[PDB]
């Protein structure tokens, strides 16, 4: 019942942040996999807040090229209200997600309770396109732009995103696993001086130094809450094939566990997003089972499960 | 040949330390792949001491929940005498194994001739449950507890193991590759302060520094014979799938060869166990061939094979 | 475009340096995957010098055990000629290869214009067998032996290789990825003191320290042109299965990109070989697709593609 193992589960069955349908079943397959039980199998305080209901906005006309903006803005608006609710209740928010546009609400609602948070973004992509730089028009590739304070005056008024007040600065976010960056995204990345560890860096330094540099960069000045937004495609498709945008050359299964293991040991985890699990895009039933089983193992390591073993505070020899 | 390449081969077709049948064929398939001939091709002096006849023990009721204790204890007792015999002949004992419970006999008979030995234990598991902390009753996940001096007093009188005397100390064994550890094992691991590199530590430091710390921890004070107990499930199941208890996220083929190449270069390899190859557990015939090939390759690196190249002390240009 | 992105492309559909047919289709499948256009989409100045026509030599009698000496010798002689020409045009020679015996011509022609070049050899093998140390007799395992000045006199007079002049010293080549070396090659490797990073060294040091030590070893004294000879079997068969001699335990896709990404940032890439892609050696159509696409990615990384992203100095 430690703070590190005190959890509030929020389901976010949302998919309109991206074209490929099925990512809304994310919260369903993760629950079906036995996540809450396996969390309770560890010494975890688990309270389920259910699946957020998302109202179907039938006529959600696009903003220029950005599609379904009112639907994405409302879903994140509900998530922000719900995330802050479980944070004021002392629990670590565990958003069980569809597409990564929900990171707007998850981080915002987290920010209303802990405005001094830092963000670790595990992803293959930066998701830092603005509504003017996007070529896909999909909002799951834009959430960071709505959330950075330095990007104010650059974000046009998108219908449904009026409640969005930027809550993090460029110095309070670190990327791990980038290997598919748009040209506009790369421009923002280097112009803001955002700390990132692309797969070039992970190869160069190893996931060991990557985590060492990541945590000290974020927890150097002061100790502050950590929000980990984990996009399942941050790991190689050989472990998470059932996702919207897979890119080869990703983080290994071991590296994904080591990231989450090292973040748990800081004791400062405060919010978690497990996004972009799509049980429709599995070429076989095993590809979905493999993806879900991987996202579950990632989450369990976020809350104490260590590869070296775990044990309760008793004498097992008596 | 030289001392590092003078080998005495002991087939150990025993399976009653674990539930799944077939691991007794381990010696058969390893020989069939040509392990003897490939060792001789790299200037090894190899003597084949034959496959040990393990007489049937029909009345072998369980000790509490521990299964087949007398068959396991006598096979390890017979292996212990056999290993000590080849060590007295000046040869490196090579045990081609069934289940890992034979390590009780492999290490004990080794210690009888070389009581100052150190153990490197490559495995996904710690194999350190006592007959009382075990929940599976399978003796192949208990051999280390029988061998540790610091556990004297916690091993009950198990039928078949009255010959057993703990021969190695807690500071004379190093684990590499752990990722599947029972809570009672984790308690024992930490309380006795055993040196270990789980998959987490291998991810943090890399196999290069792991082997540098391993060999310095064991050989730093004084040089001494090394005993390597290699469980095949220490590597990832993508390389050794034909094994009893495969666990995802293991050491790679490269990492397995680097461990064994580094151990050879010390010139202090004295005993070697190649355990848990179960040719009946491959989902396809190729998976069996792939497991055996990896096992043969790791055995060949133990006795001189190097990826950088090998050559005889002659003038290849005449 | 900039020097590091101005390329002359040479297709070398040659296979008679090795016994498995199909590697001559390397240039065809690589073009077919759109390699040229993909290079142009990242602001590269691409000039296509076409595929080299290799005439058939009927009376190609063996030189002892060495097979097809006059076809291999003439093919590399032509490639050396065409590589010197693109080098004279101030372009980076990109050789879309068949078997690795063509490196005899690629490096010789490159050394004709830049005799101070340094070679990086990404390969599971050393390819340093002499015509007398070889047991296979396949010349795609002998190219480095013809190129090293320190082995002059150890190489017999082989028909087809009278034009060859040893053009690099053993102190100017760095091997990366070794894991299958013949006894005679390893003797040569140790005797001549060639700098090398086998899979053992990549395991021990990591790909980052290997690249830093490689670039420092070749360019520490002074800037000079770099010739990258990339045998596709340097990567693990799980990423490049459609090749003649797959060896397990190879460089990862990531390590291949990292090597090529780091080589680009020096701005000194001057010659490139993409060798030993054999589309007829894939057990499934996907295995061919995987091998080519991996080869394509390694190539684009040699000319600026970066996993962290790219952008023109234009976006806000
Ligand atoms: C190819 N580019 C043009 C589009 C590309 C598509 C996939 C998304 C993935 C977002 B996530 O990693 O959260 O699934 C990012 C992207 N950059 C964009 O902006 O839509
Ligand atoms: C998971 N627990 C419940 C049991 C677990 C099963 C697998 C064995 C592996 C033995 B070996 O390393 O020889 O393959 C170890 C184990 N600890 C035990 O004690 O049987
Ligand atoms: C088996 N050994 C004895 C021979 C071996 C076969 C494969 C070639 C690979 C050439 B390449 O690296 O260009 O694909 C090297 C080799 N040394 C030789 O010389 O033929
Ligand atoms: Mn994302
Ligand atoms: Mn095991
Ligand atoms: Mn074991
Ligand atoms: Mn090769
Ligand atoms: Mn080659």
mmCIF file of N, CA and C in Angstrom, chain A residues 44-95:
data_model
loop_
_atom_site.group_PDB
_atom_site.id
_atom_site.type_symbol
_atom_site.label_atom_id
_atom_site.label_comp_id
_atom_site.label_asym_id
_atom_site.label_seq_id
_atom_site.Cartn_x
_atom_site.Cartn_y
_atom_site.Cartn_z
ATOM 1 N N UNK A 44 -0.176 -4.208 -4.347
ATOM 2 C CA UNK A 44 -0.670 -2.987 -4.971
ATOM 3 C C UNK A 44 -2.067 -2.633 -4.479
ATOM 4 N N UNK A 45 -2.279 -1.341 -4.236
ATOM 5 C CA UNK A 45 -3.593 -0.791 -3.910
ATOM 6 C C UNK A 45 -4.239 -0.346 -5.218
ATOM 7 N N UNK A 46 -5.214 -1.115 -5.696
ATOM 8 C CA UNK A 46 -5.815 -0.901 -7.008
ATOM 9 C C UNK A 46 -7.274 -0.509 -6.820
ATOM 10 N N UNK A 47 -7.649 0.651 -7.357
ATOM 11 C CA UNK A 47 -9.040 1.082 -7.424
ATOM 12 C C UNK A 47 -9.378 1.397 -8.874
ATOM 13 N N UNK A 48 -10.414 0.745 -9.394
ATOM 14 C CA UNK A 48 -10.827 0.924 -10.779
ATOM 15 C C UNK A 48 -11.871 2.029 -10.873
ATOM 16 N N UNK A 49 -11.612 3.011 -11.735
ATOM 17 C CA UNK A 49 -12.541 4.107 -11.977
ATOM 18 C C UNK A 49 -13.382 3.897 -13.230
ATOM 19 N N UNK A 50 -13.368 2.693 -13.796
ATOM 20 C CA UNK A 50 -14.208 2.375 -14.936
ATOM 21 C C UNK A 50 -13.686 2.967 -16.234
ATOM 22 N N UNK A 51 -14.439 2.710 -17.300
ATOM 23 C CA UNK A 51 -14.150 3.271 -18.613
ATOM 24 C C UNK A 51 -14.917 4.577 -18.772
ATOM 25 N N UNK A 52 -14.203 5.648 -19.095
ATOM 26 C CA UNK A 52 -14.854 6.930 -19.320
ATOM 27 C C UNK A 52 -15.803 6.823 -20.510
ATOM 28 N N UNK A 53 -17.046 7.288 -20.386
ATOM 29 C CA UNK A 53 -17.947 7.299 -21.544
ATOM 30 C C UNK A 53 -17.620 8.481 -22.447
ATOM 31 N N UNK A 54 -17.533 8.217 -23.747
ATOM 32 C CA UNK A 54 -17.168 9.232 -24.728
ATOM 33 C C UNK A 54 -18.344 9.436 -25.673
ATOM 34 N N UNK A 55 -18.945 10.621 -25.610
ATOM 35 C CA UNK A 55 -20.132 10.913 -26.401
ATOM 36 C C UNK A 55 -19.779 11.014 -27.878
ATOM 37 N N UNK A 56 -20.579 10.359 -28.716
ATOM 38 C CA UNK A 56 -20.385 10.396 -30.160
ATOM 39 C C UNK A 56 -20.875 11.737 -30.692
ATOM 40 N N UNK A 57 -19.950 12.562 -31.171
ATOM 41 C CA UNK A 57 -20.302 13.812 -31.839
ATOM 42 C C UNK A 57 -20.463 13.503 -33.323
ATOM 43 N N UNK A 58 -21.697 13.396 -33.831
ATOM 44 C CA UNK A 58 -21.876 12.881 -35.200
ATOM 45 C C UNK A 58 -21.268 13.773 -36.266
ATOM 46 N N UNK A 59 -21.523 15.075 -36.202
ATOM 47 C CA UNK A 59 -21.003 16.032 -37.174
ATOM 48 C C UNK A 59 -19.874 16.811 -36.504
ATOM 49 N N UNK A 60 -18.653 16.306 -36.660
ATOM 50 C CA UNK A 60 -17.441 16.900 -36.099
ATOM 51 C C UNK A 60 -16.576 17.293 -37.294
ATOM 52 N N UNK A 61 -16.946 18.394 -37.948
ATOM 53 C CA UNK A 61 -16.269 18.815 -39.164
ATOM 54 C C UNK A 61 -14.789 19.073 -38.888
ATOM 55 N N UNK A 62 -13.921 18.751 -39.843
ATOM 56 C CA UNK A 62 -12.478 18.893 -39.616
ATOM 57 C C UNK A 62 -12.046 20.349 -39.568
ATOM 58 N N UNK A 63 -10.978 20.597 -38.814
ATOM 59 C CA UNK A 63 -10.296 21.886 -38.821
ATOM 60 C C UNK A 63 -9.161 21.798 -39.834
ATOM 61 N N UNK A 64 -9.323 22.484 -40.968
ATOM 62 C CA UNK A 64 -8.383 22.384 -42.080
ATOM 63 C C UNK A 64 -8.160 20.923 -42.448
ATOM 64 N N UNK A 65 -7.011 20.381 -42.050
ATOM 65 C CA UNK A 65 -6.694 18.978 -42.281
ATOM 66 C C UNK A 65 -6.902 18.137 -41.020
ATOM 67 N N UNK A 66 -6.876 18.753 -39.837
ATOM 68 C CA UNK A 66 -7.087 18.033 -38.586
ATOM 69 C C UNK A 66 -8.500 17.464 -38.547
ATOM 70 N N UNK A 67 -8.608 16.158 -38.301
ATOM 71 C CA UNK A 67 -9.880 15.451 -38.335
ATOM 72 C C UNK A 67 -10.407 15.189 -36.930
ATOM 73 N N UNK A 68 -11.733 15.130 -36.826
ATOM 74 C CA UNK A 68 -12.475 14.882 -35.592
ATOM 75 C C UNK A 68 -11.928 15.688 -34.393
ATOM 76 N N UNK A 69 -11.779 17.027 -34.537
ATOM 77 C CA UNK A 69 -11.216 17.811 -33.422
ATOM 78 C C UNK A 69 -12.121 17.923 -32.203
ATOM 79 N N UNK A 70 -13.428 18.098 -32.405
ATOM 80 C CA UNK A 70 -14.329 18.224 -31.263
ATOM 81 C C UNK A 70 -14.379 16.933 -30.455
ATOM 82 N N UNK A 71 -14.328 15.784 -31.134
ATOM 83 C CA UNK A 71 -14.356 14.505 -30.430
ATOM 84 C C UNK A 71 -13.090 14.295 -29.612
ATOM 85 N N UNK A 72 -11.936 14.677 -30.162
ATOM 86 C CA UNK A 72 -10.680 14.496 -29.443
ATOM 87 C C UNK A 72 -10.585 15.473 -28.279
ATOM 88 N N UNK A 73 -11.077 16.698 -28.468
ATOM 89 C CA UNK A 73 -11.009 17.683 -27.401
ATOM 90 C C UNK A 73 -11.871 17.316 -26.209
ATOM 91 N N UNK A 74 -13.058 16.762 -26.463
ATOM 92 C CA UNK A 74 -13.937 16.370 -25.367
ATOM 93 C C UNK A 74 -13.371 15.178 -24.609
ATOM 94 N N UNK A 75 -12.892 14.164 -25.336
ATOM 95 C CA UNK A 75 -12.343 12.974 -24.691
ATOM 96 C C UNK A 75 -11.209 13.337 -23.741
ATOM 97 N N UNK A 76 -10.287 14.191 -24.191
ATOM 98 C CA UNK A 76 -9.207 14.631 -23.315
ATOM 99 C C UNK A 76 -9.718 15.555 -22.218
ATOM 100 N N UNK A 77 -10.799 16.293 -22.482
ATOM 101 C CA UNK A 77 -11.387 17.131 -21.441
ATOM 102 C C UNK A 77 -11.958 16.279 -20.313
ATOM 103 N N UNK A 78 -12.609 15.164 -20.656
ATOM 104 C CA UNK A 78 -13.106 14.254 -19.629
ATOM 105 C C UNK A 78 -11.959 13.571 -18.897
ATOM 106 N N UNK A 79 -10.927 13.151 -19.633
ATOM 107 C CA UNK A 79 -9.794 12.476 -19.007
ATOM 108 C C UNK A 79 -9.085 13.390 -18.016
ATOM 109 N N UNK A 80 -8.903 14.663 -18.378
ATOM 110 C CA UNK A 80 -8.250 15.604 -17.474
ATOM 111 C C UNK A 80 -9.040 15.766 -16.182
ATOM 112 N N UNK A 81 -10.366 15.851 -16.283
ATOM 113 C CA UNK A 81 -11.178 15.906 -15.080
ATOM 114 C C UNK A 81 -11.089 14.630 -14.266
ATOM 115 N N UNK A 82 -11.008 13.484 -14.945
ATOM 116 C CA UNK A 82 -10.954 12.206 -14.245
ATOM 117 C C UNK A 82 -9.569 11.935 -13.670
ATOM 118 N N UNK A 83 -8.510 12.267 -14.413
ATOM 119 C CA UNK A 83 -7.154 12.050 -13.911
ATOM 120 C C UNK A 83 -6.934 12.841 -12.628
ATOM 121 N N UNK A 84 -7.295 14.127 -12.642
ATOM 122 C CA UNK A 84 -7.161 14.950 -11.444
ATOM 123 C C UNK A 84 -7.976 14.393 -10.284
ATOM 124 N N UNK A 85 -9.085 13.711 -10.577
ATOM 125 C CA UNK A 85 -9.904 13.132 -9.517
ATOM 126 C C UNK A 85 -9.153 12.029 -8.780
ATOM 127 N N UNK A 86 -8.513 11.118 -9.520
ATOM 128 C CA UNK A 86 -7.769 10.045 -8.869
ATOM 129 C C UNK A 86 -6.478 10.556 -8.242
ATOM 130 N N UNK A 87 -5.950 11.688 -8.715
ATOM 131 C CA UNK A 87 -4.743 12.239 -8.109
ATOM 132 C C UNK A 87 -5.052 12.886 -6.766
ATOM 133 N N UNK A 88 -6.160 13.622 -6.679
ATOM 134 C CA UNK A 88 -6.599 14.154 -5.395
ATOM 135 C C UNK A 88 -7.018 13.059 -4.423
ATOM 136 N N UNK A 89 -7.123 11.815 -4.885
ATOM 137 C CA UNK A 89 -7.426 10.674 -4.033
ATOM 138 C C UNK A 89 -6.172 9.903 -3.632
ATOM 139 N N UNK A 90 -4.989 10.427 -3.953
ATOM 140 C CA UNK A 90 -3.731 9.858 -3.515
ATOM 141 C C UNK A 90 -3.175 8.742 -4.373
ATOM 142 N N UNK A 91 -3.821 8.404 -5.482
ATOM 143 C CA UNK A 91 -3.411 7.274 -6.301
ATOM 144 C C UNK A 91 -2.597 7.729 -7.506
ATOM 145 N N UNK A 92 -1.788 6.808 -8.020
ATOM 146 C CA UNK A 92 -1.104 7.003 -9.293
ATOM 147 C C UNK A 92 -2.106 6.737 -10.409
ATOM 148 N N UNK A 93 -2.306 7.723 -11.279
ATOM 149 C CA UNK A 93 -3.231 7.553 -12.391
ATOM 150 C C UNK A 93 -2.655 6.577 -13.408
ATOM 151 N N UNK A 94 -3.432 5.549 -13.742
ATOM 152 C CA UNK A 94 -3.065 4.558 -14.751
ATOM 153 C C UNK A 94 -4.112 4.623 -15.858
ATOM 154 N N UNK A 95 -3.856 5.460 -16.858
ATOM 155 C CA UNK A 95 -4.766 5.606 -17.988
ATOM 156 C C UNK A 95 -4.577 4.421 -18.928
#
